[PDB]
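Exercise (ungraded).
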Amino acid sequence: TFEHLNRDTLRYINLLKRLSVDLAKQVEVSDPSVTVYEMDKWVPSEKLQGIL
Amino acid sequence: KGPKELESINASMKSDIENVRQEVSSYKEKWLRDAEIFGKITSIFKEEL
């Protein structure tokens, strides 16, 4: 039983970061004073975050 | 496109209609403002014309 619980907590670790399918980003802006955009702080919509 | 961009495109056109309609009738008034004072000698000059 411990030899099964140890193997299923390594594939849980190997599923949160390593293979980890994510979203494809569309950039929306509203203020006209930004002019630079780094693609790290793109967060999804408020209605999609509540569903996910 | 994206709906948050199309909301900013469609609302920008609606404000532009509120700008061009207002600024046309500013020229429609001043061309009639020129018309009421042009006929002080020209209509009499039309009788000379």
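Further reading is listed at the end of the chapter. For now, observe: Chain A has three helices and no strands. The two ends of chain A are 33 Å apart (CA to CA).
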